[PDB]
Curated annotation (Swiss-Prot):
Function: Involved in copper import into the cell. Essential for ethylene signaling, which requires copper. Acts by delivering copper to create functional hormone receptors.
Family, as annotated: Belongs to the cation transport ATPase (P-type) (TC 3.A.3) family. Type IB subfamily.
Ranges where the HMA domain occurs: 2-68
Gene source species: Arabidopsis thaliana (Mouse-ear cress)
Residue numbers binding Cu(+) 1: 13, 16
Full-protein positions shown: 56 to 128 of 1001
Source species, domain of life: Eukaryota
Localization terms from the record: Membrane
Protein name: Copper-transporting ATPase RAN1
Length: 74
C-alpha cells in the first residue's frame, strides 16, 4: 500500500464527509479512507496495483466535490 493526502473542496457537513468516505471505500484497491471535514482532507491508503491517485481523485469528483492530491504521506 501507499498513502496519499487528498485535498477536497465543497464539504460543509457531516453527511458530506461521510459521502466522500463511502465513495472512497467503494473504489477497488482502497484499503482505508479517513476524511477530515474541517481540514478539507481525505487520507487514503491504497494498493497501487489496483488503483492510482488519479482514480481516487476522480471518485471524489464523481461524488460531487473537487479534489487534488496534496501530498504523498508514505
Ligand atoms: Li472546509
Ligand atoms: Zn453537506
Amino acid at each position: 500500500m501507499r498513502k496519499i493526502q487528498v485535498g477536497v473542496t465543497g464539504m460543509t457537513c457531516a453527511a458530506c464527509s461521510n459521502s466522500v468516505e463511502a465513495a472512497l471505500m467503494n473504489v477497488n484497491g482502497v484499503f482505508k479512507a479517513s476524511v477530515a471535514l474541517l481540514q478539507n482532507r481525505a487520507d487514503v491508503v491504497f494498493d497501487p496495483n489496483l488503483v492510482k491517485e488519479e482514480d481516487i481523485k476522480e471518485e471524489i469528483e464523481d461524488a460531487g466535490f473537487e479534489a487534488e492530491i496534496l501530498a504523498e504521506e508514505w
